[PDB]
Structure formats: structure tokens, C-alpha cells
Design an enzyme around this catalytic site. Structure first.
Site, PDB file in Angstrom:
ATOM      1  N   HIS A 121       4.304  15.594  -3.626  1.00  0.00           N
ATOM      2  CA  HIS A 121       3.018  15.184  -3.025  1.00  0.00           C
ATOM      3  C   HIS A 121       2.899  15.651  -1.589  1.00  0.00           C
ATOM      4  O   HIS A 121       1.796  15.554  -1.064  1.00  0.00           O
ATOM      5  CB  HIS A 121       2.771  13.715  -3.183  1.00  0.00           C
ATOM      6  CG  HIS A 121       3.534  12.812  -2.311  1.00  0.00           C
ATOM      7  ND1 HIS A 121       3.177  12.483  -1.054  1.00  0.00           N
ATOM      8  CD2 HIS A 121       4.691  12.172  -2.586  1.00  0.00           C
ATOM      9  CE1 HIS A 121       4.093  11.625  -0.561  1.00  0.00           C
ATOM     10  NE2 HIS A 121       4.989  11.427  -1.506  1.00  0.00           N
ATOM     11  N   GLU A 173      15.353  17.711  14.858  1.00  0.00           N
ATOM     12  CA  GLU A 173      14.377  16.911  15.585  1.00  0.00           C
ATOM     13  C   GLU A 173      14.859  15.489  15.867  1.00  0.00           C
ATOM     14  O   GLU A 173      15.419  14.833  14.969  1.00  0.00           O
ATOM     15  CB  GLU A 173      13.086  16.777  14.782  1.00  0.00           C
ATOM     16  CG  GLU A 173      12.225  18.033  14.795  1.00  0.00           C
ATOM     17  CD  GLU A 173      11.498  18.299  16.107  1.00  0.00           C
ATOM     18  OE1 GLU A 173      11.851  17.705  17.144  1.00  0.00           O
ATOM     19  OE2 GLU A 173      10.591  19.146  16.085  1.00  0.00           O
ATOM     20  N   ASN A 189      12.609  13.404  18.820  1.00  0.00           N
ATOM     21  CA  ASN A 189      11.231  13.240  19.252  1.00  0.00           C
ATOM     22  C   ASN A 189      10.473  14.489  18.766  1.00  0.00           C
ATOM     23  O   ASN A 189      10.721  15.607  19.206  1.00  0.00           O
ATOM     24  CB  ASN A 189      11.158  13.057  20.742  1.00  0.00           C
ATOM     25  CG  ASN A 189       9.772  12.657  21.161  1.00  0.00           C
ATOM     26  OD1 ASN A 189       8.800  13.205  20.684  1.00  0.00           O
ATOM     27  ND2 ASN A 189       9.668  11.680  22.002  1.00  0.00           N
ATOM     28  N   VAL A 239       8.370  16.350  21.618  1.00  0.00           N
ATOM     29  CA  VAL A 239       9.002  16.903  22.813  1.00  0.00           C
ATOM     30  C   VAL A 239      10.085  17.849  22.331  1.00  0.00           C
ATOM     31  O   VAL A 239      10.817  17.541  21.409  1.00  0.00           O
ATOM     32  CB  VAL A 239       9.612  15.767  23.644  1.00  0.00           C
ATOM     33  CG1 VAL A 239      10.377  16.317  24.843  1.00  0.00           C
ATOM     34  CG2 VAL A 239       8.548  14.728  24.058  1.00  0.00           C
ATOM     35  N   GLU A 288      16.382  21.767  18.380  1.00  0.00           N
ATOM     36  CA  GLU A 288      15.473  22.108  17.273  1.00  0.00           C
ATOM     37  C   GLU A 288      15.692  23.531  16.765  1.00  0.00           C
ATOM     38  O   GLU A 288      16.021  24.444  17.518  1.00  0.00           O
ATOM     39  CB  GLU A 288      14.014  22.005  17.666  1.00  0.00           C
ATOM     40  CG  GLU A 288      13.618  20.622  18.155  1.00  0.00           C
ATOM     41  CD  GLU A 288      13.721  20.327  19.642  1.00  0.00           C
ATOM     42  OE1 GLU A 288      14.397  21.091  20.342  1.00  0.00           O
ATOM     43  OE2 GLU A 288      13.073  19.307  19.982  1.00  0.00           O
ATOM     44  N   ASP A 318       8.213  13.701  -8.698  1.00  0.00           N
ATOM     45  CA  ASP A 318       7.718  13.923  -7.337  1.00  0.00           C
ATOM     46  C   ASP A 318       8.813  14.588  -6.493  1.00  0.00           C
ATOM     47  O   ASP A 318       9.504  13.937  -5.681  1.00  0.00           O
ATOM     48  CB  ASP A 318       7.228  12.614  -6.733  1.00  0.00           C
ATOM     49  CG  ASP A 318       6.476  12.822  -5.441  1.00  0.00           C
ATOM     50  OD1 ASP A 318       6.169  13.977  -5.119  1.00  0.00           O
ATOM     51  OD2 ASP A 318       6.331  11.812  -4.720  1.00  0.00           O
ATOM     52  N   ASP A 356      10.589  -1.359   4.856  1.00  0.00           N
ATOM     53  CA  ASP A 356      10.165  -0.365   3.859  1.00  0.00           C
ATOM     54  C   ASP A 356       9.910   0.967   4.561  1.00  0.00           C
ATOM     55  O   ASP A 356       9.756   1.048   5.792  1.00  0.00           O
ATOM     56  CB  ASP A 356       8.884  -0.851   3.165  1.00  0.00           C
ATOM     57  CG  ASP A 356       8.599  -0.290   1.795  1.00  0.00           C
ATOM     58  OD1 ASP A 356       9.323   0.573   1.342  1.00  0.00           O
ATOM     59  OD2 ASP A 356       7.527  -0.672   1.290  1.00  0.00           O
ATOM     60  N   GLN A 379       3.688   5.339   5.354  1.00  0.00           N
ATOM     61  CA  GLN A 379       2.910   6.588   5.465  1.00  0.00           C
ATOM     62  C   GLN A 379       3.611   7.497   6.488  1.00  0.00           C
ATOM     63  O   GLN A 379       3.843   7.045   7.589  1.00  0.00           O
ATOM     64  CB  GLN A 379       1.460   6.334   5.897  1.00  0.00           C
ATOM     65  CG  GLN A 379       0.538   7.566   5.824  1.00  0.00           C
ATOM     66  CD  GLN A 379      -0.915   7.139   5.693  1.00  0.00           C
ATOM     67  OE1 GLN A 379      -1.279   5.962   5.854  1.00  0.00           O
ATOM     68  NE2 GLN A 379      -1.774   8.097   5.371  1.00  0.00           N
ATOM     69  N   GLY A 380       3.889   8.734   6.108  1.00  0.00           N
ATOM     70  CA  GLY A 380       4.491   9.740   6.979  1.00  0.00           C
ATOM     71  C   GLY A 380       5.990   9.831   6.769  1.00  0.00           C
ATOM     72  O   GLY A 380       6.553  10.761   7.286  1.00  0.00           O
ATOM     73  N   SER A 421       6.945  10.022   3.647  1.00  0.00           N
ATOM     74  CA  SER A 421       6.880  10.797   2.401  1.00  0.00           C
ATOM     75  C   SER A 421       7.818  11.993   2.451  1.00  0.00           C
ATOM     76  O   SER A 421       7.751  12.733   3.429  1.00  0.00           O
ATOM     77  CB  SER A 421       5.481  11.349   2.161  1.00  0.00           C
ATOM     78  OG  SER A 421       4.641  10.365   1.711  1.00  0.00           O
ATOM     79  N   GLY A 422       8.572  12.203   1.369  1.00  0.00           N
ATOM     80  CA  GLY A 422       9.388  13.407   1.234  1.00  0.00           C
ATOM     81  C   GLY A 422      10.772  13.238   1.832  1.00  0.00           C
ATOM     82  O   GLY A 422      11.588  14.081   1.577  1.00  0.00           O
TER      83      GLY A 422
HETATM   84  C1  LIG Z   1       0.354   3.064   3.928  1.00  0.00           C
HETATM   85  O1  LIG Z   1       0.638   3.201   2.527  1.00  0.00           O
HETATM   86  C2  LIG Z   1       1.331   4.317   2.104  1.00  0.00           C
HETATM   87  C3  LIG Z   1       0.649   5.544   2.035  1.00  0.00           C
HETATM   88  C4  LIG Z   1       1.296   6.671   1.590  1.00  0.00           C
HETATM   89  C5  LIG Z   1       2.658   6.561   1.268  1.00  0.00           C
HETATM   90  N1  LIG Z   1       3.527   7.521   0.833  1.00  0.00           N
HETATM   91  C6  LIG Z   1       4.768   6.970   0.655  1.00  0.00           C
HETATM   92  C7  LIG Z   1       4.727   5.644   0.944  1.00  0.00           C
HETATM   93  C8  LIG Z   1       5.918   4.763   0.932  1.00  0.00           C
HETATM   94  C9  LIG Z   1       5.710   3.353   0.586  1.00  0.00           C
HETATM   95  N2  LIG Z   1       7.050   2.812   0.602  1.00  0.00           N
HETATM   96  C10 LIG Z   1       3.369   5.356   1.350  1.00  0.00           C
HETATM   97  C11 LIG Z   1       2.675   4.209   1.781  1.00  0.00           C
HETATM   98 CA   LIG Z   2      11.674  17.647  19.322  1.00  0.00          CA
END
Ligand SMILES: COc1ccc2[nH]cc(CCN)c2c1
Ligand SMILES: [Ca+2]
Length: 223
Positions: free
Chosen positions: A40, A52, A54, A57, A62, A84, A171, A174-175, A177-178
Site C-alpha cells: 500500500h 535517518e 531526524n 535535518v 544519511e 501487503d 500502536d 499513519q506514516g 506504514s511499511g
Molecule cells: C490513522 O489511521 C491509520 C491510517 C493509515 C494507517 N496505515 C497503517 C496504520 C497502522 C494502524 N496500526 C494506519 C492507521
Molecule cells: Ca536526516
């Protein structure tokens, strides 16, 4: 990462940032020329950023290397997020050192109860939005398949596992991911999906990397 800690600079040397003008996903360096991430996270024009801490910066450790090829799993289903996983080949090999290092693939699938390290630059809040500039870490256990299936009825395939805390509060988000889930020094998972972040009874769901080792090794050998 919600409810984590600041990892410390270059303490997670396999962690990569995927950059398309901005950080958009994590990934894991599995050898000098290949990254594993989530399907995804696919897009064209990826630069892989190694070493990486920061992400805003230039700190001096890097390596910025363009992707030459991306390979999404042939059976990736964007609706269900089954399979995925994606591989990214770098244009040139990374220079490996104590701060930029590959993570081993698993020879065995990790059991429920195993403690893992999840890392990323994702959101640190479960409500609203705050993006850290430095790498965040979370220690979390793998949950039982039964707990995972009870949390997400009809959605967990044999290529997914849950990790985290049924209580909520900690947990991936968002961000993230991967990014990697590393257990006992091996890559066991990829940050894949969940229902929100850090919600009660809604742990994170991760791609089960041990099911993909033969695909990874065959793909790398031929590309
Ligand atoms: C804010 O909601 C989101 C939005 C996209 C996402 N991708 C991966 C995750 C991990 C959840 N553990 C996630 C959560
Ligand atoms: Ca950096």
C-alpha cells in the site's frame, strides 16, 4: 507510533524512510540493494533514505538512493490488504556500517507472546495529529491468532498477525506504514493496517513476513 519512545539516532539501522518529496512510508533494508515495505506504499518516484533519525535535518549519516524498480506482491489485494508487501530495488548498493545495516529475514514464524520492536515516523496521537521528526519505537507483543481474529472478524488472513495492546494506547499509526516489526533480531512484520490507532480492542495488523521469504529470495535472485 502512539505511546512509544524516541529510539535514539541510528539505533534502528535497518529502518528506511520512503520519500517522494516528503516522508510517506517506512521500510526495511534487507540487503545492500533491496528494501521491503508495504504494497500500500507503492508509488513511482521513490527515493529511499537510509541512516535517518531526524527526517527534516541532514545530520550526517544519511544515504539517499533512488529506487530503480518496485515489485508489488503478485497477489496483493488493495481492498483486503492481503499480501501487503512490496520490494524496492535501489539504483546503487547502500554502504553498510553500524548505523546503516540490513535486517535478517526469518527462518521461522514468530509465536504469539514474542516481543517485537516497531519503529517509524508516523503520527504520535490516537486523536488529532502530531508528526515527529525523529524515529519513534514501540515494544509490543505478537497477539494470538484467536485475539486478532476476535478483534477484526472476517478480516484476518493467514498472511496477517496482530501485535500491540488490546487495552489501547500503544500502536503504530499513519506514516508508520511499511515499517518494520523486528522480533528476536529478525524481520517478522510490516506495518499494514488497523482500525484507527491505539484504540481499545483494535491492535495493529501486520504483514506476516515469514510467509514471503521464498518469494523475496526468488525475486531478489532474478532482479
Ligand atoms: C490513522 O489511521 C491509520 C491510517 C493509515 C494507517 N496505515 C497503517 C496504520 C497502522 C494502524 N496500526 C494506519 C492507521
Ligand atoms: Ca536526516
Amino acid at each position: 507510533i502512539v505511546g512509544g519512545y524516541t529510539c535514539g539516532a541510528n539505533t534502528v539501522p535497518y529502518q528506511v524512510s520512503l520519500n517522494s518529496g516528503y516522508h510517506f512510508c517506512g521500510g526495511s533494508l534487507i540487503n545492500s540493494q533491496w528494501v521491503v515495505s508495504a504494497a500500500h506504499c507503492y508509488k513511482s518516484g521513490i527515493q529511499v533514505r537510509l541512516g535517518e533519525d531526524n527526517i527534516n535535518v541532514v545530520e550526517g549519516n544519511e544515504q539517499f538512493i533512488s529506487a530503480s524498480k518496485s515489485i508489488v506482491h503478485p497477489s496483493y489485494n488493495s481492498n483486503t490488504l492481503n499480501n501487503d508487501i512490496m520490494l524496492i530495488k535501489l539504483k546503487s548498493a547502500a554502504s553498510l556500517n553500524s548505523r546503516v545495516a540490513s535486517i535478517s529475514l526469518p527462518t521461522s514464524c514468530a509465536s504469539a507472546g514474542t516481543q517485537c520492536l516497531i519503529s517509524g515516523w508516523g503520527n504520535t496521537k490516537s486523536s488529532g495529529t502530531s508528526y515527529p521528526d525523529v524515529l519513534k519505537c514501540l515494544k509490543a507483543p505478537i497477539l494470538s491468532d484467536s485475539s486478532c481474529k476476535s478483534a477484526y472478524p472476517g478480516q484476518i488472513t493467514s498472511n496477517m498477525f496482530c501485535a500491540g495492546y488490546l487495552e489501547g494506547g500503544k500502536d503504530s499509526c499513519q506514516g508508520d506504514s511499511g515499517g518494520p516489526v523486528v522480533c528476536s533480531g529478525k524481520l517478522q512484520g510490516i506495518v499494514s493496517w488497523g482500525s484507527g490507532c491505539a484504540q481499545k480492542n483494535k491492535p495493529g495488523v501486520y504483514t506476516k513476513v515469514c510467509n514471503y521469504v521464498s518469494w523475496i529470495k526468488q525475486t531478489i535472485a532474478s532482479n
